[PDB]
Amino acid sequence: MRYPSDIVDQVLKAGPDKGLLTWEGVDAACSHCSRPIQNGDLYSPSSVGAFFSDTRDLASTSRSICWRCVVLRKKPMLYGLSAAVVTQDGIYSISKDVNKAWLFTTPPPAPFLVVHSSSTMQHLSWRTPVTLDNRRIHVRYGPNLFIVRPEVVRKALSIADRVNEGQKKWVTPVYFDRKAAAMGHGLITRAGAEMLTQEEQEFFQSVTPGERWALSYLMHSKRPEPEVGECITEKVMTSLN
DNA sequence: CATCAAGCCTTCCTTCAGGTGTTGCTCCAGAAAGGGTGT
Ligand SMILES: [Zn+2]
Numbered sequence: 001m002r003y004p005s006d007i008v009d010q011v012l013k014a015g016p017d018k019g020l021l022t023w024e025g026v027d028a029a030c031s032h033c034s035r036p037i038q039n040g041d042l043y044s045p046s047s048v049g050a051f052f053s054d055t056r057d058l059a060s061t062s063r064s065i066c067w068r069c070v071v072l073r074k075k076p077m078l079y080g081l082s083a084a085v086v087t088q089d090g091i092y093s094i095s096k097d098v099n100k101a102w103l104f105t106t107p108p109p110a111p112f113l114v115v116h117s118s119s120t121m122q123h124l125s126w127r128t129p130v131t132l133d134n135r136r137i138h139v140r141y142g143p144n145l146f147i148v149r150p151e152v153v154r155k156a157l158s159i160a161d162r163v164n165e166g167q168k169k170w171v172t173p174v175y176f177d178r179k180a181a182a183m184g185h186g187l188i189t190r191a192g193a194e195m196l197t198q199e200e201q202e203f204f205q206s207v208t209p210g211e212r213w214a215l216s217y218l219m220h221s222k223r224p225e226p227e228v229g230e231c232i233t234e235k236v237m238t239s240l241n
Numbered sequence: 242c243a244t245c246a247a248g249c250c251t252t253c254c255t256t257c258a259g260g261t262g263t264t265g266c267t268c269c270a271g272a273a274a275g276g277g278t279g280t
Pocket of ligand 1: 005029030032033066
């Protein structure tokens, strides 16, 4: 649970592909896992093709991919975790907005790992740290790393629900972009500007951009009740094996 | 050759026309994995 690559042995159980070399000499960290490849640990020379665009998120320049990250770099394990949270018991999907409501309000207490895709398929899982504490979640979204606090998320939800009590039409205080791509992502609306107090406007400005991205999946009009995603670790284990 | 009248009045705008149609975006921003083949 210390490194993201621990979702290969502890969870989504798999072994080395056995065409891998055995590490020798002084230990070096893996280029993808950030895990130290010790002596006697299975590793591959880094045979990444030219379509690998995640050099900026490589942990080290060792050119040595650990076997756990070889399993992490498998394409079924790439697209199978396009929207997933990997707890210690299994992998769950966060594609639905109710699933992100369960992820970002009352999250599971495990040292989980939140990976999400801003595109069709990205080298996504190895570059993001594990969320050891529940209150600080390291989300990976596309090319960016994101930090989400569940309690501040519930505070923003309480404010957003409170400012729309007694109104027939549900109006958002602040626009947030699901792609986290618009210029107005984080810009407060004029209904929100006329409704929210300045302390609450500075509160909605004070949240992390990962929290803005999360609130985009959970500030829409048809407000999502937090519901657990269906367990997909059997699905991605079958796709892997 | 000098004044002496060296203007007066009253008109002093009228009627519609005072848009119509159409465009009113397109696409992509993946990267293995399985095959080739070219030095
Ligand atoms: Zn590694």
